[PDB]
Amino acid sequence: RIAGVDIPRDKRVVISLTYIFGIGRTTAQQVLKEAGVSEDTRVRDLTEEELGKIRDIIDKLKVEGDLRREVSLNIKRLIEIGSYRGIRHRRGLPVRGQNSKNNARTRK
Amino acid sequence: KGPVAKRDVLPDPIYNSKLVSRLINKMMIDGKKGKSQTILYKSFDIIKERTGNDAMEVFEQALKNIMPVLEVKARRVGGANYQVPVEVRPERRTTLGLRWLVNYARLRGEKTMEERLANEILDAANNTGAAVKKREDTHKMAEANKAFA
């Protein structure tokens, strides 16, 4: 399926494309204008023309494994160079500058 | 101190009843009479459609099935924890009926409270239903504790 990962057949296109790692709502609406599917179809109901345009538009976009590997490269970069922000990446303490005597409970 | 009383508004533009606007003021979440009026009239239009009757009489029949004669109050003397049954005065009969309609309707679960209130009125009409479990159980609690009156 489209980027090597599924989209659900029984949703609309705008939100079935959200389940691809790298496309949210607004890049999905930027796609389907360029593709011309008019945002009101199931993806169980498309044509091979109409879904192939979606495929190669997304092939032009930085989506599936590129995003994960490059964001891991950024995180490993500022872990390895030193970089207190990567120290927060490592330890499980919040990165953006946030109080830690209380919650900080996404990270530990 | 002494007892204080309250008021309520007479009509509804369709279904001209006091108590139906009393149900409108009930089930109001966060100060929205508009949403409760929409839920109520769309529900009664379902009750007029799904059963070919006027929904006023079905609604009063559902009320008559739910309105409890006997609450069971509390009375703890010593270490006893007795519950004591009370003949309910009819204002509280109507308002306990409306609470049980509203609570067990939204506790049921369907694809709008339009449908839940409609099906809860349709169940409380032909008495077997979810709020009428609470009606029956309160009368059973009064039946068990009848030794005190």
């Binding site: - | 508004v9 009509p11 509804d12 533009p13 606007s21 409108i24 009479k33 508009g34 009026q37």
Partner: protein
């Protein structure tokens, strides 16, 4: 042109009852064009239904302030006042219905140390 002012909940309506057939005109718009939720439409019509005023005056209303139910209260109060100025007769009917009260239930002033003019924040021992 009988004229009456109605005040309700920081809203003021100016109801002029012209001799007509029953059109109510709220700021050059009509009723449901400006007031939805027809419980307000039946409540706004109650002085005109208690005494028989059903099709004998068109209504022209200049409203400002408050919200839509506040404007409903201001319009019905202005109707009852201008409709007393029309005929002094049925003042007992309006007074038994309210309609010469101007419900003075203004929203209370917030107090210090309270959240919302009665609300205490939360108590912990």
């Amino acid at each position: 042109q009988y004229y009456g002012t109605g005040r309700r909940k920081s809203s003021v309506a100016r109801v002029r009852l012209v001799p007509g057939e029953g059109r109510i005109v709220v700021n050059n718009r009509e009723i449901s064009e400006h007031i939805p939720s027809a419980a307000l439409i039946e409540d706004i019509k109650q002085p005109l239904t208690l005494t028989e005023t059903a099709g004998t005056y068109d209504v022209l209303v200049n409203v400002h302030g408050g919200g839509l139910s506040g404007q409903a209260g201001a319009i019905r109060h202005g109707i009852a006042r201008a409709l007393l100025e029309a005929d002094p007769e049925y003042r007992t009917t309006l007074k038994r219905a309210g309609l010469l009260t101007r419900d003075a239930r203004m929203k209370e002033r917030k107090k210090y140390g309270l959240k919302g003019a009665r609300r205490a924040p939360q108590f912990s021992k």
